Structures are given as C-alpha cells and as structure tokens.
Amino acid sequence: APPTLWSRVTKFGSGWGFWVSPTVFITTTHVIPTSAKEFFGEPLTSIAIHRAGEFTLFRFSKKIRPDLTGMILEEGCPEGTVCSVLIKRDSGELLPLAVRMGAIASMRIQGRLVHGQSGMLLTGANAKGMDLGTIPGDCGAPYVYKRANDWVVCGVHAAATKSGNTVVCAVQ
Amino acid sequence: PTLWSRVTKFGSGWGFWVSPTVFITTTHVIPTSAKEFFGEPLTSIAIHRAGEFTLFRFSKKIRPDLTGMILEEGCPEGTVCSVLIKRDSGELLPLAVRMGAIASMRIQGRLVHGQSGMLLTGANAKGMDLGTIPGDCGAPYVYKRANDWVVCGVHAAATKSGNTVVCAVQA
Numbered sequence: 001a002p003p004t005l006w007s008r009v010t011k012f013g014s015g016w017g018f019w020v021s022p023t024v025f026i027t028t029t030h031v032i033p034t035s036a037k038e039f040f041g042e043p044l045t046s047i048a049i050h051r052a053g054e055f056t057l058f059r060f061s062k063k064i065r066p067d068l069t070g071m072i073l074e075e076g077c078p079e080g081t082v083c084s085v086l087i088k089r090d091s092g093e094l095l096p097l098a099v100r101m102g103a104i105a106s107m108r109i110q111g112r113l114v115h116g117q118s119g120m121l122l123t124g125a126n127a128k129g130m131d132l133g134t135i136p137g138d139c140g141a142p143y144v145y146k147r148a149n150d151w152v153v154c155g156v157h158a159a160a161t162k163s164g165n166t167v168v169c170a171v172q
Numbered sequence: 173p174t175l176w177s178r179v180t181k182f183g184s185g186w187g188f189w190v191s192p193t194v195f196i197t198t199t200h201v202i203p204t205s206a207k208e209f210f211g212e213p214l215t216s217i218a219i220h221r222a223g224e225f226t227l228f229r230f231s232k233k234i235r236p237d238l239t240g241m242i243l244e245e246g247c248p249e250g251t252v253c254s255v256l257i258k259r260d261s262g263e264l265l266p267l268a269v270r271m272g273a274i275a276s277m278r279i280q281g282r283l284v285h286g287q288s289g290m291l292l293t294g295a296n297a298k299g300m301d302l303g304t305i306p307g308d309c310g311a312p313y314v315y316k317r318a319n320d321w322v323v324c325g326v327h328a329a330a331t332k333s334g335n336t337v338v339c340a341v342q343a
C-alpha cells in the first residue's frame with residue numbers, strides 16, 4: 001500500500017485510527033479512552049463526534065494534519081472486493097493483510113455483539129495468531145482498496161473470530 | 173518469537189532460518205562470488221543443492237534465539253500454504269496459496285521444477301499487495317498442522333498474470 005496511506009495510520013487508545021483528511025479522523029468506538037476530554041491538543045467542545053455503533057468519526061475545527069490531502073471514505077464496499085487491512089506491528093513492520101469482503105453481518109464474537117461488513121482473510125488456511133491473522137491491538141486499523149487510479153477507505157477493524165478466518169469492519 | 177524473524181534478505185532475494193544452523197533459499201538468488209555468508213567462511217558451510225532448492229548447514233549457531241522447525245519435501249495437494257513475502261518497503265505480505273502437483277512448468281518461457289500453487293487472491297495486481305514480484309524469490313512456503321508449523325519449500329517462479337507460482341522443494 002502507498003506510503004501516504006501508512007502515514008495516516010495513528011496509534012490511538014488501545015488500538016489505531018486513520019486520517020481521511022487534515023480535519024477528519026476515524027476509529028473503532030471501543031478503542032477510545034472513555035475518560036478522554038482532549039484529542040490532538042483540542043477540547044471536546046471544538047470537535048464534532050459522529051458515532052454509529054463501533055464506527056466513530058471525529059471532525060476537527062482546525063487542520064490537525066495539513067501534510068495530508070482529503071481522500072474518499074465510503075460506507076463499506078461491494079461484496080467480493082479484495083481489501084488490505086493496514087496493520088502496524090513491533091518495530092516499523094507493516095502488515096497489509098488481504099481480505100475478501102462479504103455481506104453486512106451481525107455476529108456474537110467472544111460474548112460481544114458486533115455489526116459491520118464481514119470478510120474472510122486470504123493469508124492462510126486458518127489465521128489463528130499474530131503471524132497470519134489479527135490480534136485485539138489491531139482494532140481501528142483501516143480497510144482500503146484501489147479503484148482505477150486511486151485508493152478508497154471503507155471501514156475500520158472491529159473484531160475477529162477465535163479461528164481468525166472471519167473479520168468484521170465497522171462502517172459509516 | 174515470530175516466523176517473520178526467520179525470513180532474511182539474501183543475495184538477489186530472501187531465505188529462511190529452519191533452525192539455529194540451517195538456512196534454506198532459492199538456488200538462483202545465491203551470490204556466485206563469495207568467501208563468507210553471515211560471517212562464516214564458506215570453508216565451514218555444507219551446501220546441498222537440488223535444482224532451485226538450496227540448504228546451507230553451518231558448523232556453529234548463527235541464530236541461537238531460534239528453535240528447530242519441521243522441514244518437509246512439499247505438502248499434500250489441496251494444502252493452503254502461506255508464502256511469507258518481505259518487501260524492501262518494510263511490508264510483510266503473507267499470501268494464501270492452494271498447492272497442486274509437483275511438475276516441470278513453463279513459466280515466462282523457462283522450465284522450472286517444483287510444486288505448483290495458485291493464489292487465493294486470484295484476480296490481478298492493482299496494488300501488488302495481492303501477488304508476487306521477481307525480488308520475492310527465496311520466500312518460504314509454510315502451513316500449520318495440528319500444533320506445529322511446517323516449512324515445505326521456497327519461492328522459485330511466478331507467471332505474468334501472477335495466478336500460478338512454483339515452490340522449489342527438498343530432494
């Protein structure tokens with residue numbers, strides 16, 4: 001995936017979030033610190049927070065990331081699209097895990113009720129563990145794919161099954 | 173403790189530490205002018221070559237941090253392997269590959285002997301985090317069997333469409 005998409009992935013709470021533009025940051029609701037009253041040096045009162053289940057969007061009154069261009073955010077992707085999940089791991093290692101996307105789904109994953117776009121990892125037979133699959137610390141990592149001449153972001157990492165084969169992306 | 177630490181830049185591609193003393197790679201990526209590898213004189217290294225598969229056995233522990241892994245001569249047909257690709261970008265690309273028969277295959281005009289495979293990404297490039305490139309040669313083919321990881325060969329060749337790959341195997 002291009003260097004400018006990796007530059008948008010920010011360590012945040014117990015996982016990650018993604019800069020769509022200089023003023024828009026998206027993440028998974030459950031990684032947000034529940035006591036937090038300030039983000040990137042800005043008070044809550046100067047932020048527009050839009051939460052739909054496990055999808056949260058922050059819109060800032062000022063340009064936090066002026067090095068960035070605004071890119072397209074869509075509400076999931078067509079069934080069958082192959083996406084990359086942009087996962088950062090220990091010591092500047094970059095893991096763009098390939099996932100074939102499926103239908104909008106509701107699941108029970110480790111007792112928790114999760115809703116979003118389901119997908120199947122294309123990394124191995126069974127992706128149990130950190131070498132071929134996701135870990136809980138990956139929540140908030142973006143789902144991206146390339147169209148003709150450009151890249152789209154279509155959601156953020158919310159959950160994975162105990163086998164590791166099935167993932168859920170939270171969508172706007 | 174990670175499989176990824178075993179994948180090492182080597183020659184014109186990569187190789188893989190099976191154990192503290194055993195390193196496998198693709199024959200064509202190996203330097204043809206050398207007096208040492210990983211600081212050990214070639215004097216003290218056993219080299220076993222079979223077609224596009226090469227195994228190095230060192231006389232001392234180069235990677236004492238590692239346990240020994242199972243190395244086998246390919247895998248059953250229908251096994252879904254992962255090819256553990258490292259890129260000079262810093263990206264790690266594990267790609268699912270459905271494995272087929274051992275054969276001599278014509279790959280972009282040359283004959284390559286090894287185990288055929290097809291990527292589960294299938295479609296195309298369009299963000300080459302979905303297929304292989306020439307600099308990937310020597311990347312290992314692994315799969316999980318019960319509690320155990322198995323390595324069953326090294327990346328030797330791929331077709332232009334990138335659907336078909338060849339895993340060079342021991343013996």
Ligand SMILES: O=C(COc1ccccc1)Nc1ccccc1O
Pocket residue numbers: 010040041064065
């Ligand atoms: O403003 C920031 C970082 O935090 C600060 C620093 C100084 C004063 C106020 C806030 N930008 C930034 C850079 C890289 C990634 C995400 C970011 O928000």
